[PDB]
Amino acid sequence: AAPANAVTADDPTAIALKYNQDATKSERVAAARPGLPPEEQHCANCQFMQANVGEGDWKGCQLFPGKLINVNGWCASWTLKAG
Ligand code: SF4
Fold this sequence. Notes:
Blueprint: H1 12-17, H2 28-31, E1 49-55, E2 58-61, E3 69-70
Bound molecules: iron/sulfur cluster.
The site of iron/sulfur cluster has 13 residues, from loops.
PDB class: electron transport
Keywords: iron-sulfur protein, electron transport
Assembly: monomeric
């Protein structure tokens, strides 16, 4: 069950970025974002995931202020967690 402030499928930014709370139901292979092979990409290893926001599998994303993403999700702004 998603938190009340989870990013949802009719959020206009979710649509533009092709966000899905489940990376296995995403277009990460088509996007081929750099940094890791696409099958290895999800929010937990993305630079914009905020691990001090949320709880459990539902964490912050800098690009979605006031909301929570799922650590197992993905979107086209995926960027390797480098620091
Ligand atoms: S920017 Fe990164 S953390 Fe935020 S939704 Fe997209 S893949 Fe997940």
